[PDB]
Amino acid sequence: GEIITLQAGQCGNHVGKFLWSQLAKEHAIGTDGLSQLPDSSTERDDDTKPFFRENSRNKFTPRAIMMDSEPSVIADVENTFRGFFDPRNTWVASDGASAGNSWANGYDIGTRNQDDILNKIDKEIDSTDNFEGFQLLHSVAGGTGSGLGSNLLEALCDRYPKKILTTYSVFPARSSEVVVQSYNTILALRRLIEDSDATVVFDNASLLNISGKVFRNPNIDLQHTNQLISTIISSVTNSIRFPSYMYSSMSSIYSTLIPSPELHFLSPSFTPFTSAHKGHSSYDVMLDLLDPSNSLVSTAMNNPTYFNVYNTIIGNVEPRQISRAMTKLQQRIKFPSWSSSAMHVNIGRRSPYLPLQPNENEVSGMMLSNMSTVVNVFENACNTFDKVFAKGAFLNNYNVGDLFQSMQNVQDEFAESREVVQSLMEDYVAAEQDSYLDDVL
Amino acid sequence: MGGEIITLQAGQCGNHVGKFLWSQLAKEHAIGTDGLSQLPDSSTERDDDTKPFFRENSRNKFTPRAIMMDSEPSVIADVENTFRGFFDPRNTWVASDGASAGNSWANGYDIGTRNQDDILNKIDKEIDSTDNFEGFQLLHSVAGGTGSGLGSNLLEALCDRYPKKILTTYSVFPARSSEVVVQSYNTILALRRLIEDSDATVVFDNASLLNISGKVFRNPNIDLQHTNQLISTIISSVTNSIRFPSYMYSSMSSIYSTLIPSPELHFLSPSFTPFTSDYIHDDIAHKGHSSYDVMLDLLDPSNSLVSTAMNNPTYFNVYNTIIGNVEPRQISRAMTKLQQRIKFPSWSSSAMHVNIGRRSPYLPLQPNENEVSGMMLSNMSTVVNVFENACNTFDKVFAKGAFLNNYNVGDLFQSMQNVQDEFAESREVVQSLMEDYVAAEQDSYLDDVLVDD
Amino acid sequence: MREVISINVGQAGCQIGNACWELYSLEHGIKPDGHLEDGLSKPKGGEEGFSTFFHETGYGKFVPRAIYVDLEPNVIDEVRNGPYKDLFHPEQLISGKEDAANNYARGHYTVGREILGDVLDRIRKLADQCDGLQGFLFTHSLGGGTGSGLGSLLLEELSAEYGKKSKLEFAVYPAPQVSTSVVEPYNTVLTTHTTLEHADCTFMVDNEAIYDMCKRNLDIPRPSFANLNNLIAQVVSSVTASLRFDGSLNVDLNEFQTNLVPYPRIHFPLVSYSPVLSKSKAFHESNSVSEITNACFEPGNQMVKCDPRDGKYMATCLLYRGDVVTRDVQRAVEQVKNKKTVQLVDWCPTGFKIGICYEPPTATPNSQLATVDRAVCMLSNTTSIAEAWKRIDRKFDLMYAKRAFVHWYVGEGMEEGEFTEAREDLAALERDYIEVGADS
Numbered sequence A: 001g002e003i004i005t006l007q008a009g010q011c012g013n014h015v016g017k018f019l020w021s022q023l024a025k026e027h028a029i030g031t032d033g034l035s036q037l038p039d040s041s042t043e044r045d046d047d048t049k050p051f052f053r054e055n056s057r058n059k060f061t062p063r064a065i066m067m068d069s070e071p072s073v074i075a076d077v078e079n080t081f082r083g084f085f086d087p088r089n090t091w092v093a094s095d096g097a098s099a100g101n102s103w104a105n106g107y108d109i110g111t112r113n114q115d116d117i118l119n120k121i122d123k124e125i126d127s128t129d130n131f132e133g134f135q136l137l138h139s140v141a142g143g144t145g146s147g148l149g150s151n152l153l154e155a156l157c158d159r160y161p162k163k164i165l166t167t168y169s170v171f172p173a174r175s176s177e178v179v180v181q182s183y184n185t186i187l188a189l190r191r192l193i194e195d196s197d198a199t200v201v202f203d204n205a206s207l208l209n210i211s212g213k214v215f216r217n218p219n220i221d222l223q224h225t226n227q228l229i230s231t232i233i234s235s236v237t238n239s240i241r242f243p244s245y246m247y248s249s250m251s252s253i254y255s256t257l258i259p260s261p262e263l264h265f266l267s268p269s270f271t272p273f274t275s276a277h278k279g280h281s282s283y284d285v286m287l288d289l290l291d292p293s294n295s296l297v298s299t300a301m302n303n304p305t306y307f308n309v310y311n312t313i314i315g316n317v318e319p320r321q322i323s324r325a326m327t328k329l330q331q332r333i334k335f336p337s338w339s340s341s342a343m344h345v346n347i348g349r350r351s352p353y354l355p356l357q358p359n360e361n362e363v364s365g366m367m368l369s370n371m372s373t374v375v376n377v378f379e380n381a382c383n384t385f386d387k388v389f390a391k392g393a394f395l396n397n398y399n400v401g402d403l404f405q406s407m408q409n410v411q412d413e414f415a416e417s418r419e420v421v422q423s424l425m426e427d428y429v430a431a432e433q434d435s436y437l438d439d440v441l
Numbered sequence B: 001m002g003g004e005i006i007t008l009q010a011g012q013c014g015n016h017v018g019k020f021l022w023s024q025l026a027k028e029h030a031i032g033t034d035g036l037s038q039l040p041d042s043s044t045e046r047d048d049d050t051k052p053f054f055r056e057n058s059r060n061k062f063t064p065r066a067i068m069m070d071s072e073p074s075v076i077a078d079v080e081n082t083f084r085g086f087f088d089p090r091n092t093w094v095a096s097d098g099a100s101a102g103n104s105w106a107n108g109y110d111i112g113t114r115n116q117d118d119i120l121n122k123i124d125k126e127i128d129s130t131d132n133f134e135g136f137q138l139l140h141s142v143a144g145g146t147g148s149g150l151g152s153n154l155l156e157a158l159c160d161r162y163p164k165k166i167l168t169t170y171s172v173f174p175a176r177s178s179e180v181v182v183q184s185y186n187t188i189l190a191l192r193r194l195i196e197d198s199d200a201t202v203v204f205d206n207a208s209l210l211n212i213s214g215k216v217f218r219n220p221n222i223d224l225q226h227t228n229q230l231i232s233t234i235i236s237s238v239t240n241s242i243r244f245p246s247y248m249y250s251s252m253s254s255i256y257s258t259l260i261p262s263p264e265l266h267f268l269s270p271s272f273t274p275f276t277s278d279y280i281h282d283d284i285a286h287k288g289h290s291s292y293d294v295m296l297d298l299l300d301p302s303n304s305l306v307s308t309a310m311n312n313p314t315y316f317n318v319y320n321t322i323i324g325n326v327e328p329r330q331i332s333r334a335m336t337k338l339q340q341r342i343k344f345p346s347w348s349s350s351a352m353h354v355n356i357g358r359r360s361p362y363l364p365l366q367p368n369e370n371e372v373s374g375m376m377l378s379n380m381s382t383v384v385n386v387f388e389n390a391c392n393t394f395d396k397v398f399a400k401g402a403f404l405n406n407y408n409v410g411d412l413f414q415s416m417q418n419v420q421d422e423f424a425e426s427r428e429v430v431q432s433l434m435e436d437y438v439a440a441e442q443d444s445y446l447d448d449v450l451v452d453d
Numbered sequence C: 001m002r003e004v005i006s007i008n009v010g011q012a013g014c015q016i017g018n019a020c021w022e023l024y025s026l027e028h029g030i031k032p033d034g035h036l037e038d039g040l041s042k043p044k045g046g047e048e049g050f051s052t053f054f055h056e057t058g059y060g061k062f063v064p065r066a067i068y069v070d071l072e073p074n075v076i077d078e079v080r081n082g083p084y085k086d087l088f089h090p091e092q093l094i095s096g097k098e099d100a101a102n103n104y105a106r107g108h109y110t111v112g113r114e115i116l117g118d119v120l121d122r123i124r125k126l127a128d129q130c131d132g133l134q135g136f137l138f139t140h141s142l143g144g145g146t147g148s149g150l151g152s153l154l155l156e157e158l159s160a161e162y163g164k165k166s167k168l169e170f171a172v173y174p175a176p177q178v179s180t181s182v183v184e185p186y187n188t189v190l191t192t193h194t195t196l197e198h199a200d201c202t203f204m205v206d207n208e209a210i211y212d213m214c215k216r217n218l219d220i221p222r223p224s225f226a227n228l229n230n231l232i233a234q235v236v237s238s239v240t241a242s243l244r245f246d247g248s249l250n251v252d253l254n255e256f257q258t259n260l261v262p263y264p265r266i267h268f269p270l271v272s273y274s275p276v277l278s279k280s281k282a283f284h285e286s287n288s289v290s291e292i293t294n295a296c297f298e299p300g301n302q303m304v305k306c307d308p309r310d311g312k313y314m315a316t317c318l319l320y321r322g323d324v325v326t327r328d329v330q331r332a333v334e335q336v337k338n339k340k341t342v343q344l345v346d347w348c349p350t351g352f353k354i355g356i357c358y359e360p361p362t363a364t365p366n367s368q369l370a371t372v373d374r375a376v377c378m379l380s381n382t383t384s385i386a387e388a389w390k391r392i393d394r395k396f397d398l399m400y401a402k403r404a405f406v407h408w409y410v411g412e413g414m415e416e417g418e419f420t421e422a423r424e425d426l427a428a429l430e431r432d433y434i435e436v437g438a439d440s
């Protein structure tokens, strides 16, 4: 049941810092790690064991490991959270600052210093007994981050074949670095196709747009984006962190969301939230979640083919409004003729040890979906990669180790990545059709 | 079955470790530096037992049952001036021979044999002053030639002077021997006598000592005083079982019964958690470890005091002593976790041994993070590699016979051929020892008796 | 093993001794009055130091034990006019009315033995005054044949009298490029032969190398003999700091005798000192331990007109004066091992002796010195010493081929046989060093 957070790259470090601050504010842990709750009452309804290891000093150390080639962001996080994290759970590869935004250098550093990471994760696992899997937070655009993520994914799949792995990948926005970052993105995508079990996608452009819409200042900061990522991760993990009757593990969530390991990419949405009045009921929250103006990914589709959806509503809700919103969603959303029209609603309790968020008494809702927008994003990324590769031969100039010894193997690996992502999008557009399950029907 | 033990300080390093050990024992038993016990003589009730290590001349003064023997009187005078009235001036041996004329084991053995009558007379006087006795504890400090020679002479005298007493020795090995030839020669010549007469020997490689001193301490520079303080604390922890008598191990003989499977295998490897009685011991309440984590740290190679070089290490006798408020369920959990991680020989089904001691009621109580400490002693053939370093040095230098003009003087042999033959004999002895170790590492060692019955 | 008897022979040797005593007085802040200077220094006065070189009397006045032997009255009057004579004893200093010869012909003659007897009984009385003995220190120049011969005679007499303590002989080697006197290589070879006969440890220091050092490092326009004397004083003080003052890792003279002699016949170590630079370079920035360890191996600091890169590495020592971290110098020596500047051997390479002393270096007002809290003096054993030997031996061979002056030497106190013996022994030493170095 215990999940270990893996913060890869400076993006991973930022999102981990934000998520741990949010979880401390929720479970009354603070920055010092000591239990901010009185020692007179031990009855608690939350679950901090899979995320926080409680020591004899009653301090809750976050079960997180930071793997990054840039020690500056790790030192900044340690300075901001002095007394929170464990110095033994810090890994900077002892190679200095980062150098090169390609996947090759990241994977080479991972393969070189895999022994230290393996020892760290083995110690973290042996510290407890009940284990379920790991949690990875990285960006597919960052070269070193993607390399470290691929290395740790390979290590996990060839060491612990029984632990389900979930990751959160934030795709880059429409910018200049996509001529080279697309290589790292498609390599991470191939690694996810090969070994990953669950992945939650994010689009940087859509995230920036949503943050600029919900915020007053249009100058959206990367810290604000990381705060939004922390909020969505807390909303999707509330069901595990506060288990009451139905949901007590991510296993059931991924069972009801992911139908097959070939389709293990999920698009999140969450509305409404701040980062002070109530104006949206549960029906309003559900229709806003359905509307593309509240999703954390770029839809770019008039009517996406919804395969599996699951929503968690936070707040005091009425079954009548729940049924009305469910009927409206069933009437609006179209489901394929081969897959069932399953719609799951989980009522997540609020944390009494968490300070009151702005816009009090406003019911909110998160929704994880599997539709044909992630495939549009993947198609855009693969088209950009194909264009830049077939037009300019510049990727053979920035490589390390085996990728630098010969550039032919690099082109072969990239062609294999393109082939596997093409097979993925073909399987997705086939599952979009009703003739997908015709082999048994 | 518990008897008194007399401390034998030899050489500069030996005298430093002895002074540090006696200061630590005084701090533990509330004795102090002035010699007079800081505790009043009215509260006679004492849970510890200083009698095996301290002579009770008066009711408020505990004179340590120790004898210092060295050629450099400067360190002895410094120790005596620092500890006013603590040590016994009659137990200080200098022979008025001046500074050591080199760092040769030959000169060491010569200066030992010349004044062997004085040290034996002092030992006899201490034996007449005491009433009970069990054995001696010698500090070789084999890194120094004169100290190693003095220790070898002391051992060669004690073996045939008191055969009814068990002899334990502590040999401090350097990290990177400066003069490889001289240091290897001295270590091999001392190891010869260790194999011949010594009953138990504990090695202390300075590499892990410097590593721990750079890790747990804040100052990057390492000083020899707080370096020897580590061995001081180790000797204090291993003698705690007799100072504060536990309920399982209460005598050095009973401890060595399970620590030594055979007199041929009398070399151990120590390991200790981050210390709490050293100078910089403030960074210990941030770990928050239990007894299971203490056992894990003891079994970890980063906390050992000798060169681990763990390449499938063969264990023969593993023993651990935990001091503090220890939990039996946590001990059982640690034993279950260690029996599936420690390699054990298929011929002997003997597992690791656990002992629980008592903490001093006058020592500064540590917080619940590091209130309980642990020590581990394991019979591993990894010291064979530390010895093979010196054996390879001997094999690569003995081709020409360098430094033969230094070991020819002092000893009973002045010719080159006799010294060469003695060095070859000592090399053959240590080679046969390493062969015995690599044979005991296999299962045929116990089959040597099964093949003929 | 505490007292060291130092002897100053010849004009250059007496000047070097004056400079070394002046530097010893400056390090401890010793003035001519003293009583130690004063009797509250701790440890600039008793106990050690000064008790290794300065004999202690009843009144507490430290007496620098030095035997100023010379046959030129000018140098004797010069050393007597200063306060050094008040520091010394009139019987310890020997006076000579007429110089022996030009220069070694009469330096080893019976006139040498007439003073040998006197200085021998004087040394016996001085050893009776003090307690214990560590070694014999010698300070004379090979350029001066009279001083070199008298030093060789003192060395032979001390070896034949006691032979218990090792004899240290600091030999000042002339410039291999230019020779002021025509008899200079002959006396140099004869003195090297006498040292091979009766010396357990020698020292090779070139004057041209010191001149190039003070011209390049110290940046002085007019080098003088006083600067060379002060640099030699700094060298000797860096060697004997561990005996004068205490440190974290104190070393003994027996450790030096063992380290510098890794073979039956190896007693020729080179000296280097770092950092030596101008005062402006030290005022601008400060160097690290790695820079000092790299400069220790430079050809300039070797104090010899030869390149140590072509030489082969043997057992070397490094003494560190001042606050010095052990891990820092360990990392530095590991970096030097990784660089592989000097070619190593199969026996010595793991022989980097590391000694530490708490006494920081002192900058004399006459000669500029880099004011650094950590100084390093390295006693190396390289095979470029054999190259300098072969150069001076080819010079001596061409000379002895012509030599223009054989009749004077064969008539006064020598013969062609002694010259041939010295030449053959020097060549044998050179080839033996080459073969024992290149045997790896």
Ligand SMILES: Nc1nc2c(ncn2[C@@H]2O[C@H](COP(=O)(O)OP(=O)(O)OP(=O)(O)O)[C@@H](O)[C@H]2O)c(=O)[nH]1
Pocket: A009, A010, A011, A014, A068, A069, A070, A098, A100, A101, A102, A139, A140, A141, A142, A143, A144, A145, A146, A170, A171, A172, A204, A222, A223, A225, A226
């Ligand atoms: N949203 C968000 N993304 C970030 C943040 N920091 C880094 N990133 C990601 O990092 C990418 C840029 O590359 P880099 O920052 O150099 O990451 P990298 O290539 O792995 O190099 P290092 O981070 O130094 O290891 C962007 O595309 C982002 O996706 C952040 O604070 N917020």
Ligand SMILES: Nc1nc2c(ncn2[C@@H]2O[C@H](COP(=O)(O)OP(=O)(O)OP(=O)(O)O)[C@@H](O)[C@H]2O)c(=O)[nH]1
Pocket: B010, B011, B012, B013, B014, B016, B070, B071, B072, B100, B102, B103, B143, B144, B145, B146, B147, B148, B174, B206, B224, B225, B227, B228
């Ligand atoms: N780590 C450590 N080593 C020491 C210490 N004291 C002496 N040594 C060892 O001693 C060696 C130096 O020689 P000395 O200390 O003079 O030993 P010795 O030559 O036998 O002289 P004596 O000990 O007086 O008989 C070094 O190589 C050290 O390994 C100490 O306090 N700490």
